[PDB]
């Protein structure tokens, strides 16, 4: 299956050059720009590892383009992706993440059901990449 | 090219695109109308170059189960059943491009008992349609069978003069003025004057809730006393309405209960709180033995301008179905609008057992009332006692007259203004029941009675040609 | 002090024509008329005795005339009150009540107060006249 | 195991001929058909995958065969059911389904139990086919 996450994950995976354009929207907002990576895909995984600390102040899209290559030669077998910070008040939030880097075969999601109360039930998201050890996932 | 393409709908009907709601099923001028259907009547103003029956089969559709494209999702439900139909539509009397359209809609369409989703169809988003520059909901027919799901009135009209011992005559009462900046204190010695003086009742204004100046517990406490005080004067059971509106259920509940454990006969509720408090109030009441008056505030909002909005006389419907016991229908003499033919409508909406069509009075449906209890009617503002002769023939004798000003605003006190409403009422109730032209003699009846009642006179003298004549806004399509 | 319980105890009190209109108000309306009278003043007191039967299907003010005269040979003493019954359905109730015999003395009530839970307060309403006995109470 | 979901599933595996007579049958109650198809065999996954859109207004067994024949071809290892719809008020349901696929071998259910309160427990049903990801189930 495709993971979905991100703002762009319905269109092709984004060549360094649309990588690049999106960099520089963020550069020309005054956002910083980070990068994180993971091998757990749950929807609901907030902290994806960090890839150094956040580029605060960017003038040059160059500086993150390097970054991104000096993560995938570590880590392009699993999730990149690419965030955009605004720290002004009332957002003081991400306001853009994408996904840069994909593993070849995701397989998914097992829908975990438990009985519970009359008709209720409880549910689970269970990765099958989880299924191994951090390292032999992808 | 896939198995998505090869089972597509080839029918006319459910193949995609955009057709005519008045070729969707939601036009049917040859529909027959079932007693359990729920009938709605709207006035429609197309936009330049829409058809009317397109007009009124898009409000008829989008009211019910149509959306904007076909879908092929219909052919999973009895489609043909739930369907509104929009089965009469007709040219208004004396206008160029507005017309009647009458529409159908099955019971099954509803939630029982919830005033919140009958308007969720009826209202939800078809006043706001680009292809009608203006829409108003005139009429509604609630069958008997989704009237039975609905409480109707806590206490009722009857119920009510039972709890209140008082019988053929309408009820009196008066708003605490200043509208807000008094305190709890002063609140209980304006309330004590007033029962004391003559009147049955007085009220919180609508905007008096719990403010810097007057927080809500020390004036229930006050009012209790005067209401108490008075009982104990006058031999007569008194009110005074505890205005429990507020901005949780939590905090309202709270205040209701409050009055409750005080013993109060009568609380209040603003319209404002909307549909589900009001519900919710209403079995409350029922619940706790509590007369519930209904202030219809901000209901001139939609209520005003004929080409648009909703009829005060649908508002009465649903608020009767909620279960309140009183309700603001107008004065016709006083400060706010109020035409004499509009209002007969909606008093005799609130109060008959059943209705006949009455195009005069804007009754467009006969209403059976499935016995539910009745509302009484309500008016108030601007009103004082030399117009009691045009009172009691305008609005009858159930109703609560409500004179805020007309008592307060009298130059020898709180006390006098309510003895002069008091005696004028009378006056005018056993000059009407012995046969005496009433309208013609009132005048008259109100300087006979003056004539051994000093507050009276006073009254007379300082408002007897208060009058506020203005062009109603809300008027009839039709003349007898 | 004045009992004001009635529909016309702000005017003075009926005479006997006036009392007679009123009969003929409610015989136009064939609503059912009796008589009550009582010696407990008290705004809850919801059953004043009977003086016979209501009087159904009414031609005649002056057969409701001669038990008023009746009634006051009686307790003229004490309150008696007129009452009017309408069994439309939807109705079915009082539509009409007036006192047409007061006694000449009322005292009228006490407001008794007790103390309750914080500032709330129990009240109740005591008739001076029953300080006395039925029978020499006025 | 046998999962025996289906009106006829205690019976052998239809034949085309059996299947074409179900079909005949809903034909002429004037029923929809539709085709639907899962690899997780719960009995709680209430929404196995649509083979197209429902077929509405039916005139013809054979086109239904057909798209029966398709979806068999494209899903052959795991399960198929033909379902029936009655949309006369106070149906609005489906009034048959019947198994007409199932994978060559289903290993079924691990009953899973967890400790609760008292001598209570909770239960959860686990599919051993859904060990794997969805493709390389059956
Ligand atoms: O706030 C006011 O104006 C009143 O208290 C009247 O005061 P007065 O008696 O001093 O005029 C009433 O709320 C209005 O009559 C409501 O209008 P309606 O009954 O039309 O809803
Ligand atoms: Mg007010």
Chains 1, 3, 4 share one sequence.
């Not at chain 1, 955009?84 to 397989?107: H, K, M, Q, W």
């Not at chain 2, 829409?135 to 009722?156: N, S």
């Not at chain 2, 939590?250 to 009055?259: I, K, N």
């Not at chain 2, 051994?452 to 008027?475: E, H, M, R, V």
Request: aromatic residues 12%.
């Amino acid at each position: 299956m495709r993971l979905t996450q991100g703002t762009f994950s319905f269109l092709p995976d984004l060549t360094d050059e649309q990588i690049k354009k999106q960099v520089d929207y963020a550069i020309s907002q005054n956002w910083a720009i980070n990068i994180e990576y993971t091998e757990d895909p749950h929807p609901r995984n907030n902290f994806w590892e960090l890839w150094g600390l956040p580029l605060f102040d960017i003038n040059d899209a160059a500086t993150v383009m390097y970054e991104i290559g000096s993560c995938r030669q570590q880590h392009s077998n699993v999730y990149i992706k690419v965030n955009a910070f605004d720290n002004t008040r009332g957002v003081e939030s991400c306001v853009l993440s994408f996904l840069i880097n994909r593993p070849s075969y995701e397989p998914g999601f097992r829908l975990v059901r438990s009985e519970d109360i009359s008709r209720n039930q409880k549910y689970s998201f269970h990765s099958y990449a989880t299924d191994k050890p951090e390292g032999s996932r992808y | 090219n896939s198995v998505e393409e090869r089972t597509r709908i080839k029918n006319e009907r459910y193949e995609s695109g955009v057709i005519p709601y008045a070729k969707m099923g939601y036009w049917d001028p040859n529909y027959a109308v079932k007693d359990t259907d729920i009938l709605a009547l709207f006035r429609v103003s197309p936009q330049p170059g829409v058809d009317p029956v397109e007009a009124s089969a898009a409000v008829a559709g989008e009211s019910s189960t149509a959306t904007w494209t076909v879908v092929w999702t219909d052919l999973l439900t009895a489609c043909d059943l739930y369907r509104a139909k929009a089965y009469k539509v007709e040219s208004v009397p004396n206008t160029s491009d507005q017309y009647f359209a009458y529409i159908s809609y099955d019971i099954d369409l509803f939630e029982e008992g919830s005033i919140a989703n009958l308007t969720a169809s009826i209202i939800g988003n078809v006043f706001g349609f680009k292809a009608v520059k203006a829409l108003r909901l005139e009429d509604m027919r609630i069958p008997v069978a989704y009237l039975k799901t609905f409480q109707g009135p806590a206490t009722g009209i009857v119920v009510e003069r039972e709890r209140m011992d008082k019988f053929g005559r309408p009820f009196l009462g008066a708003t605490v003025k200043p509208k807000l900046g008094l305190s709890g204190k002063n609140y209980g010695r304006v309330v004590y004057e007033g029962l004391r003086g003559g009147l049955d009742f007085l009220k919180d204004d609508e905007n008096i809730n719990s403010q810097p100046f007057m927080r809500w517990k020390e004036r229930f406490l006050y009012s209790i006393e005067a209401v108490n005080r008075s009982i104990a004067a006058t031999g007569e059971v008194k009110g005074h309405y505890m205005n429990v509106t507020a901005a949780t259920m939590e905090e309202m509940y709270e205040r209701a209960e409050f009055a409750k454990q005080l013993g109060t006969v009568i609380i209040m509720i603003d319209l404002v709180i909307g549909y589900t408090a009001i519900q919710t109030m209403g079995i409350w009441a029922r619940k706790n033995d509590m007369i519930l008056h209904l202030h219809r505030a901000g209901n001139s909002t939609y209520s005003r301008q004929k080409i648009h909005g909703m009829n005060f006389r649908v508002i009465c419907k649903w608020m009767r179905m909620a279960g309140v016991d009183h309700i603001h229908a107008g004065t016709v003499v006083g400060k706010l609008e109020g035409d004499p033919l509009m209002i007969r409508g909606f008093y005799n909406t609130l109060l008959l057992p059943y209705l006949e069509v009455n195009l005069p009075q804007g009754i467009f449906f006969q209403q059976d009332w499935a016995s539910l209890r009745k509302v009484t009617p309500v008016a108030s503002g601007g009103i004082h006692c030399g117009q009691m002769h045009q009172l009691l023939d305008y609005l009858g004798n159930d109703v609560v007259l409500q004179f805020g000003g007309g008592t307060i605003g009298h130059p020898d006190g709180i006390q006098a203004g309510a003895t002069a409403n008091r005696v004028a009422l009378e006056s005018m109730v056993i000059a009407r029941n012995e046969g005496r032209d009433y309208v013609a003699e009132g005048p008259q009846i109100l300087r006979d009675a003056a004539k051994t009642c000093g507050p009276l006179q006073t009254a007379l003298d300082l408002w007897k040609d208060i009058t506020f004549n203005y062009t109603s806004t809300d008027t009839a399509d039709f003349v007898e």
